[PDB]
Amino acid sequence: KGPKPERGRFLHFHSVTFWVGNAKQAASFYCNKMGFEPLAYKGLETGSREVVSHVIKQGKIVFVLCSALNPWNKEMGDHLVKHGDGVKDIAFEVEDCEHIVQKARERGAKIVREPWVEEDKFGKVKFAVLQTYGDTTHTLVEKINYTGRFLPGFEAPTYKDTLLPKLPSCNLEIIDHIVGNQPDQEMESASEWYLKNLQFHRFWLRSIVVANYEESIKMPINEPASQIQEYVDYNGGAGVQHIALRTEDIITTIRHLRERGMEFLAVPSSYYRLLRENLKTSKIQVKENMDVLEELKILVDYDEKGYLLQIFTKPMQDRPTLFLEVIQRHNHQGFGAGNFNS
C-alpha cells in the first residue's frame, strides 16, 4: 500500500466530462436510456460562449456532456475528429488541492491549469487540471463553503424532458471503477503516473489497477497482449475504455435499463449451465434468483466470501471504444476475472 500521503486526500470520483459531437442529444441519450436526470447547464444563455455543458446525475454519478459552440474550435474539434464522442476529464473531489498539485508538479506531472477559485452566492470551489494518459485529464475539485447543486457558473437546466418521469428508476449509485486503455507497452508508465504523481498504490489484455490511499478511487490500466489494440486503433491512442456504475440491486437496475431500451452483450445459455453446476459445490451462495439473472444476461464471479454481479452495455457509439458496466458487489473486490474467460 506504500506510505500514507502526508497531505491531501482524493475523496471520490466527482464527475466525468465527455467531449461529444452533440451535447444536447448525448444528454437526452444518457437520461432516457441510462436513467440519468438533468442537473445543470452552461452555454450561450448563461454567458458561456465557447463551450456548452449539460450536467446530468444519478445517485452520486455525475456525467458532464460538452460541445464547442463555434465552428473551427481547435482543441475540442481536433479531439472530436480524433476520438469521436468520448471521455475528456475524470474529476476527483479532494481535500487540499494546492498540496496535491504541488506534489504532482514536483514528481513530474504536467499541470494543464494552475489552481483557481470560482465563487457565487453559494460559495467557493477550488480547481486544478492535470494531464494523464492520452488526452485524458483530471480536474481536482475542492469545495470550500459550497451549498450549490453542482458547481459555480452552472445554472438550472434550460430544458425539460417530460418522458423522464414516466420511465422506471435505474438506481445506479456511484462510480466503481474507470478503465484506461493504453498503447502497447504504455501500461507501466500510465500506471506509474498515479503511483508517483498522485501517491496512489497498486490496488489488488494486460492490466494493473491503481487506487488512492483509502481505495475509494479505482483506476484499472490496460495494455494489449486484441480488444485493447482495437480500442487504440479506433480511439487513435490511449483513453477511457469503460465506466463501471454500481447498484445495490442489479436485477431491478437491469430490468429497468432494459425497459428503457438499453442493450447489453450476449451471453450463451451454456454460461449459466456451467455456472449452476460450479455453484453447487461451494461455500458461497448467490442471493439473487439465478433464473432471473440468466433471463437478464447478468454475469457472476465468485470467491470464498463474496461474488460480484456485472453486466456490460453495448458501445455508446459506433466506434468500438467506450462502453459502460453495471456492477453489484457481495463482499468481493475482483473485477470479472473469471467471466472474462467464461
Ligand X SMILES: COc1ccc(-c2c(S(C)(=O)=O)ccc(C(=O)c3cnn(C(C)(C)C)c3O)c2C)cc1
Closest approach of Cβ 159 to Fe ion, in Å?
A: 22
- For residue 223, state whether it binds ligand X (rule: CB under 6 A): no
State which of positions 274-303 bind its own copies (CB under 8 A). none
Closest approach of Cβ 43 to Fe ion, in Å?
A: 25
93 close to 11: Cβ distance less than 8 angstroms = yes
State which of positions 30-59 bind its own copies (CB under 8 A). 32-33, 43-44, 52
Which helix (H) or strand (E) segment holds residue 36: the answer is none
Which helix (H) or strand (E) segment holds residue 38: the answer is strand 37-42
313 close to 262: Cβ distance less than 8 angstroms = yes
Closest approach of Cβ 79 to its own copies, in Å?
A: 10
Q: What is the DSSP string of 103-124?
A: HHHHHT--EEEEEEEEEETTEE
Rounded CA separation 199/192 (Å): 10
Q: Is 159 helix (H, G, I), strand (E, B) or coil?
A: coil
339 binds, among its own copies, ligand X, Fe ion, none (CB under 5 to 8 A by kind): ligand X
- Select 66 or 267, whichever has its Cβ closest to Fe ion: 267
Select from 4, 81, 270, 304 the one that contacts its own copies (CB under 8 A): 81
- For residue 255, state whether it binds its own copies (rule: CB under 8 A): no
C-alpha cell at 201: 498504490
User: Does the annotation flag 256 for ligand binding?
Assistant: no
- Select 70 or 282, whichever has its Cβ closest to its own copies: 70
Cβ within 8 Å of residue 287, ≥6 positions away:
330
Phi, then psi, of 101 in degrees rounded to 5: -65, -50
Select from 58, 222, 235, 321 the one that contacts ligand X (CB under 6 A): 222
- For residue 325, state whether it binds Fe ion (rule: CB under 5 A): yes
State which of positions 191-220 bind ligand X (CB under 6 A). 207, 209, 220
Query: How many chain residues interact with Fe ion (CB under 5 A)?
Result: 4
- For residue 311, state whether it binds its own copies (rule: CB under 8 A): no
Closest approach of Cβ 318 to Fe ion, in Å?
A: 22
Per-residue b/e over 17-34, b at no fewer than 16 CB within 10 Å?
bbbbeebbebbbbbbbbb
- For residue 82, state whether it binds its own copies (rule: CB under 8 A): yes
Q: Strand locations in the chain, DSSP E?
A: 9-19, 37-42, 51-58, 61-68, 86-95, 111-120, 123-131, 137-143, 172-181, 201-202, 206-211, 218-223, 239-247, 299-302, 307-312, 323-330
Segment contacting ligand X by CB under 6 A, of 2-10, 134-142, 155-163, 331-339: 331-339
- Select 135 or 325, whichever has its Cβ closest to Fe ion: 325
Residue numbers belonging to the annotated binding site for Fe cation: 177, 242, 325
Footprint of ligand X (CB under 6 A)? 177, 179, 207, 209, 220, 222, 227, 242, 265, 299, 312, 323, 325, 335-337, 339-340
